[PDB]
């Protein structure tokens, strides 16, 4: 739960500052209840089985993809004496923590901060559904 907050603060911070930056996990972890709806055959349930590990495995793969992306970027980015900044180091730390528990270039970065926010959100939703009760 010290994790959940780390994830949630990164999301709040992405949410607050992403404007100042220009420019299948969803199903594998689909909630049982959303199954009753035509347009959404695995699922997970309020309790948090092979489906379960599929979901988690999927989340974990997603994170590995992003972890590489962020480290590569951060390596390039280090040449900008403005050193690095922070949302990406935030996202990265959360990625690392989650994994354990389980100009041209400045544009490529904008694009990514965005793509991951959308995805940490999903991860955060399944994680929150899995506590619930």
């Amino acid at each position: 739960q010290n994790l959940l907050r780390a994830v949630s603060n990164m999301l709040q911070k992405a949410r607050q500052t992403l404007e100042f930056y220009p420019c299948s996990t969803v199903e594998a972890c689909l909630p049982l209840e959303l199954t009753k709806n035509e347009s959404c055959t695995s699922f997970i349930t309020n309790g948090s089985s092979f489906m379960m590990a599929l979901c988690l495995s999927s989340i974990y793969e997603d994170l590995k993809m992003y972890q590489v992306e962020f480290k590569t970027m951060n390596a390039k980015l280090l040449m900008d004496p403005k050193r690095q900044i922070f949302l990406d180091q935030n996202m990265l730390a959360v990625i690392d923590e989650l994994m354990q528990a389980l100009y041209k270039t400045k544009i490529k970065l904008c694009i990514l901060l965005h793509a991951f926010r959308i995805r940490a959100v999903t991860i955060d939703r399944v994680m929150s559904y899995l506590n619930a009760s």
Partner: protein, 282 residues
């Protein structure tokens, strides 16, 4: 020169006085050849004759219900490079040049859009929508309407085969056709449902004061229209008494009395808070 709806056309014109008009040609759709007459509606003057009337458009008077088949001409103004936005009011507020405003009550795929005009006379409005452009996806919209009086119109749409859990990555586009008299404008709005959410208010608050305490236990429940499962579609709630607020994602909180209100917010995207829900502190 193009076709809007059935038997209606739009003529795009640089509104500059010195700019060329369009040499327009109205083929009378009625294969009868014969010596044929040509008029502009209530206009008695047989403006032309034959079969294929032909004319110079450049002014509104040059626009109208021509008659021989039917043929309506509406004009699209263009000034200094930009199309006219006369018929509607720039609600400014959101981002300037914001004519169409939308809102969603949840991730259902359903949403309302509304706009403003100063007009009251002839005013027709068309409305279409889809998700994506280079390979659109279906959205079904209802019909434009007087909602309140500046006069306000709104419409309702529903994304078609919509999974509330779907990550959005191509925005929804709403297209609006406006025709005030003989003038033709058209508006456009692009958004992701997650950005336009405004949820209904917290449902049924409750106090549950405790002995040895001026401190109360306030509670409520998710509004009926919100998305389920709730733990997946989290709302964050602000709990106020009247700073002294309390932010939580739980459906209760502990305050101190002396009223008590609660509003909701998507947990992740749209910041639009829900209308307050209150209760008397005593």
């Amino acid at each position: 020169i193009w076709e809007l709806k059935k038997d209606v056309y739009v003529v795009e014109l640089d509104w500059y006085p010195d700019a060329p008009g369009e040499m327009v040609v109205l083929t009378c759709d009625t294969p009868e050849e014969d010596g044929i007459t040509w008029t502009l509606d209530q206009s008695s003057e047989v403006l032309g004759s034959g079969k294929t009337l032909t004319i110079q458009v450049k002014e509104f008077g040059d626009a109208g219900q021509y008659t021989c088949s039917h043929s309506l001409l509406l004009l699209h103004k263009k000034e200094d490079g930009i199309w006219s936005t006369d018929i509607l009011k720039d609600q400014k507020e959101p981002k300037n040049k914001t004519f169409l405003r939308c809102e969603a009550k949840n991730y259902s795929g359903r949403f309302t859009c509304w706009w403003l005009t100063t007009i009251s006379t002839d005013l027709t409005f068309s409305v279409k929508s889809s998700r994506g452009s280079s390979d659109p996806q279906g959205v079904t919209c209802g019909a434009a309407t007087l909602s309140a009086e500046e006069y306000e119109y709104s419409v309702e749409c529903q994304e078609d085969s919509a999974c509330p859990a779907a990550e959005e990555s191509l925005p929804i586009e709403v297209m609006v056709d406006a025709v005030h008299k003989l003038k033709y404008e058209n508006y456009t709005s692009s958004f992701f449902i997650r950005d336009i959410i405004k949820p209904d208010p917290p449902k049924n608050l409750q106090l549950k004061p405790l002995k040895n305490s001026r401190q109360v236990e306030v509670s409520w429940e998710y509004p009926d229209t919100w998305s389920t499962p709730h733990s997946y579609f989290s709302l964050t709630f602000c709990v106020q008494v009247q700073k002294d607020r309390v932010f939580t994602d739980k459906t209760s909180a502990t305050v101190i009395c002396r009223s008590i209100s609660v509003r909701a917010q998507d947990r992740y995207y749209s910041s639009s808070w829900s209308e307050w829900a209150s209760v008397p502190c005593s």
